[PDB]
């Protein structure tokens with residue numbers, strides 16, 4: 467039987483891990499590979515190095531039916547080595563289990579590798595507190611059992627269903643926070659249930675790659691040598707997390723850019739409330755949708771290094787190139803940063819957040835403070851920061 471490897475993810479972190487797995491196996495030029503990574507465009511001059519390499523789009527967290535037309539090209543007994551986003555695993559595997567069910571004679575699942583989307587899985591599991599988690603697991607197993615007949619896609623508990631894959635397939639989970647599963651008491655029946663099928667997400671695989679594969683991976687994730695160069699400076703590094711706009715009582719976007727430079731100055735200037743030290747090299751990490759606001763900040767900030775807004779923090783962590791300190795406007799990205807690297811997280815105004823107390827009740831901030839990742843004093847409501 468032929469193994470076909472499937473790499474599926476609508477988001478970023480699983481994809482970045484799956485592109486790592488491909489890099490690790492990149493000497494194999496003809497292994498059947500199907501890439502459904504919505505956010506990553508593999509360059510042609512990588513693709514043409516390979517054969518039996520295929521691409522499928524995702525629509526609504528599911529590969530399209532063009533997936534079947536690819537799999538049809540492989541008429542043998544085939545087993546599927548599948549890589550998935552955890553939060554979206556059910557929808558992603560839907561069309562795959564359909565192809566399986568439609569060809570039970572010859573198609574089997576070799577194994578699953580599942581990676582956190584991010585803060586989402588953990589914000590989701592918090593909502594499950596006060597449920598009988600043992601009971602929820604068993605029901606979801608029961609429903610999965612009836613489902614690789616497709617007599618199911620009605621999970622009573624969509625969140626817990628993400629974690630019963632072992633009842634049917636060999637699986638490995640890669641968790642952003644194993645500390646959460648081990649320390650959330652309500653999740654003890656799930657922790658124990660999962661036994662040896664989970665591990666902490668590795669951030670170090672890049673370190674064990676060859677320099678050739680390291681360069682390969684940087685190409686896969688669109689991380690050029692000049693940005694890399696900037697981030698290897700033998701000096702303390704601070705990275706400011708930029709944003710778009712908020713409720714500033716104006717729709718003049720330049721005002722939001724200006725304000726963000728004020729926020730930056732609170733880290734970089736001795737007068738600022740959150741001054742990090744004179745010895746820090748300053749970087750700006752713009753929001754991906756920041757647009758011309760990122761252009762404004764760049765053009766009006768002195769002695770800063772821009773890190774292209776399409777470069778994610780997850781890629782900085784995958785590559786071992788995360789700064790000494792991260793600070794600035796709140797984003798879910800902070801949930802996955804090492805505790806010792808978080809300086810101050812600044813929440814701007816919106817419908818939900820109109821104060822520091824509001825910001826301390828942010829769903830990912832709740833997970834964070836529970837895990838001891840941050841202190842309340844690290845959470846700043848933007849209005850308490852004076853005009854410099």
Ligand SMILES: Nc1ccn([C@@H]2O[C@H](COP(=O)(O)O)[C@@H](O)[C@H]2O)c(=O)n1
Nearest residue numbers: 707708751752753754778779797798799
């Ligand atoms: N400065 C920033 C702000 C957000 N981001 C990323 O962009 C995405 C959108 O962030 P928000 O949901 O906070 O608007 C997040 O997934 C986060 O990883 C970033 O890479 N740099």
